[PDB]
Design a protein around this nucleic acid. Structure first.
Length: 48
RNA sequence: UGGGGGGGCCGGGCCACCCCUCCCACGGCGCGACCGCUGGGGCGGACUGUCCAGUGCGCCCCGGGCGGGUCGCGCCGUCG
């Protein structure tokens, strides 16, 4: 069978629904607000 | 006092006067359109924080602000 028909048949391209499965890279503003929030929470916990 | 010294002879254009009016260049002022950046709302969602709060992202809405580049227009100035 191989020697009588070697040509390849590509699988048809599927339409894409565009779902993201990973996690996007966090931004500078987000991480700076995160560190500010952590600092404030630590100060509040020290206050109590 | 024949010699010597002068005025000249007829048309055209231009700049000077006084006014109108083009196109172009340069500067200023103002108006308008096309572009960049920035504060609010809505929708969807992703995330963060040892109180329920907060932060980006994609779409739309934006009233807009700022600024310079292109084009159009009006006005002012040039022994242009």
């Amino acid at each position: 069978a191989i020697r009588e028909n070697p040509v390849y048949e590509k699988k048809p391209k599927r339409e894409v629904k565009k779902k993201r499965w990973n996690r996007p890279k966090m931004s500078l503003a987000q991480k700076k607000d995160r560190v500010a929030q952590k600092k404030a929470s630590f100060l509040r916990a020290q206050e109590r």
